[PDB]
Symmetry: D2
Subunit: 121 residues, 4 copies
Amino acid sequence: AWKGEVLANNEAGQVTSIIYNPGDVITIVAAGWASYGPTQKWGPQGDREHPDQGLICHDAFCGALVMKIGNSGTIPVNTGLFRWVAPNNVQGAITLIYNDVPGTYGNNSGSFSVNIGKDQS
Amino acid sequence: AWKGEVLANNEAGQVTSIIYNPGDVITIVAAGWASYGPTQKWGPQGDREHPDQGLICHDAFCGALVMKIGNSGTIPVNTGLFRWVAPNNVQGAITLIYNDVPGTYGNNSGSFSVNIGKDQS
Amino acid sequence: AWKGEVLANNEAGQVTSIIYNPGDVITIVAAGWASYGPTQKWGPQGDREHPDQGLICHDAFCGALVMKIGNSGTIPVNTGLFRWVAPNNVQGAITLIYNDVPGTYGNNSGSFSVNIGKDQS
Amino acid sequence: AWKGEVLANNEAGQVTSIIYNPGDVITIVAAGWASYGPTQKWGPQGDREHPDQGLICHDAFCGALVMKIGNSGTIPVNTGLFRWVAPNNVQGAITLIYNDVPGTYGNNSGSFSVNIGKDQS
Ligand SMILES: O=C1C=C/C(=C(/c2ccc(O[C@@H]3O[C@H](CO)[C@H](O)[C@H](O)[C@H]3O)c(Cl)c2)c2ccccc2S(=O)(=O)O)C=C1Cl
Ligand SMILES: O=C1C=C/C(=C(/c2ccc(O[C@@H]3O[C@H](CO)[C@H](O)[C@H](O)[C@H]3O)c(Cl)c2)c2ccccc2S(=O)(=O)O)C=C1Cl
Ligand SMILES: O=C1C=C/C(=C(/c2ccc(O[C@@H]3O[C@H](CO)[C@H](O)[C@H](O)[C@H]3O)c(Cl)c2)c2ccccc2S(=O)(=O)O)C=C1Cl
Ligand SMILES: O=C1C=C/C(=C(/c2ccc(O[C@@H]3O[C@H](CO)[C@H](O)[C@H](O)[C@H]3O)c(Cl)c2)c2ccccc2S(=O)(=O)O)C=C1Cl
Ligand SMILES: [Ca+2]
Ligand SMILES: [Ca+2]
Ligand SMILES: [Ca+2]
Ligand SMILES: [Ca+2]
């Protein structure tokens, strides 16, 4: 099990102690408030009224919580995943990233508290 | 396990099949968008900028996801709970409710998709 | 969780901290060597070559591990159960018992090391 | 979650769908009756009164259930394991074998019904 924070101003993303292996079933629960620039802040689901202007994950709103599993493409996490299995041939360490446009994280603020654990399978 | 919708305009709240027993460990994951009256919609965490004007749950923002186990006070759920254990002497059927001011659920819209399951204890 | 030893001479049976509730899913693992009289010892499955001369559990060999959920009838356990759901209307505390004949427990020796834990559901 | 039979006369061992990884936690429940030659059968714990004439697992009775993880030395399984964590540097596929002497499996009979599953870590 892993528990830490993901800073919005972290373009590199926060690496976790979890390593997803084929067949694993995980569960994620994220909370907190972050911002992709503006003064106000949004939840893990992001800003639904802001358009996709070249985010790292086009399957989630700007300011939403996404993740990389090893060397895979970005994967939507949002509020979290419940007893979830990854697509075929996806394996590696889980890495939580704040969904924002590359090279803009500079003005970001806030963070997300995230819990990750492997369920029984 | 349980999975269903929780309407923001349901003052009575949505009842689930889950019944929390002493010692049980549960996990919740909530997603979706709802509104406590206005036009825009907030996540399960609610509206952090909206002041508490008499919510059924004072430990959560307006438009946040709360719950009631049996017939206790409202307990914050927000984005969800991760391998969580209720306080002492708390037990009964789990009821999900939209955190709003009593008698105002009229102009509410949207809903939350919620998953509930018990983890090994 | 619960971990303890069930004595073969204990006619009343060992009472665990596990309280089975409707819907629950449990897993049991039993090991060790015990006897229903002789100098020989058998595993949690009991002695397959000994007739039923009035055992508290007729669906399990003599010298085998059984249990009673609350105030129900004896239920076979043996080596243990894997993610197991109790029959309809079965609920209560869990008591582990060495399968023998009422009043004969006197000359019994040995014990069973048993682990019981509520599983995910 | 694997479930199958471990034939007694199968020397090379029964290969399961499980691929244990570092940090993993598993639970095993073995049941049934087998034999290493005689006409009488023993449980997953084996025959406690038969000496070691060159077993493949010197830490478990002859006729007991053992397993090999990747390229490790045989490990006693017996009645099973409860929320068990493999030793340091132990990883790979799982192979359940009937503990015996190399080349004698010829006259073995019976098998063990076994369940394997990863618990929430
Ligand atoms: O020509 C323009 C038109 C609208 C506009 C507003 C705007 C633009 C961006 C923005 O946040 C930026 O978003 C990107 C990536 O998503 C990056 O994170 C930047 O660092 C952020 O500053 C905000 Cl908060 C506002 C605007 C205003 C009102 C309604 C809609 C918009 S829109 O851009 O979404 O269309 C800015 C320019 Cl230059
Ligand atoms: O005298 C007033 C001053 C401001 C004001 C705005 C307001 C108030 C409430 C509100 O949502 C209501 O919230 C309650 C429960 O929390 C209930 O759900 C009602 O049905 C909702 O209408 C909204 Cl959307 C707006 C106002 C405007 C701008 C900034 C802040 C506020 S305030 O919320 O702080 O009051 C309304 C009145 Cl009458
Ligand atoms: O007519 C009979 C013929 C043989 C016989 C032997 C026997 C009986 C009991 C026994 O263990 C006792 O079992 C009872 C209840 O199950 C109680 O637990 C006592 O405390 C125990 O001592 C044993 Cl180990 C043996 C016998 C002898 C040789 C082979 C098989 C048997 S048999 O019992 O399987 O028939 C008893 C009777 Cl009545
Ligand atoms: O000189 C002897 C004296 C007793 C004896 C009995 C015996 C030996 C082996 C056996 O099964 C064999 O076990 C080996 C592996 O350990 C292998 O599986 C063979 O294929 C099997 O045939 C049986 Cl069923 C019986 C015996 C009897 C009672 C108690 C102890 C023993 S002993 O094994 O210690 O000797 C065999 C010989 Cl050669
Ligand atoms: Ca930015
Ligand atoms: Ca309202
Ligand atoms: Ca007896
Ligand atoms: Ca043999």
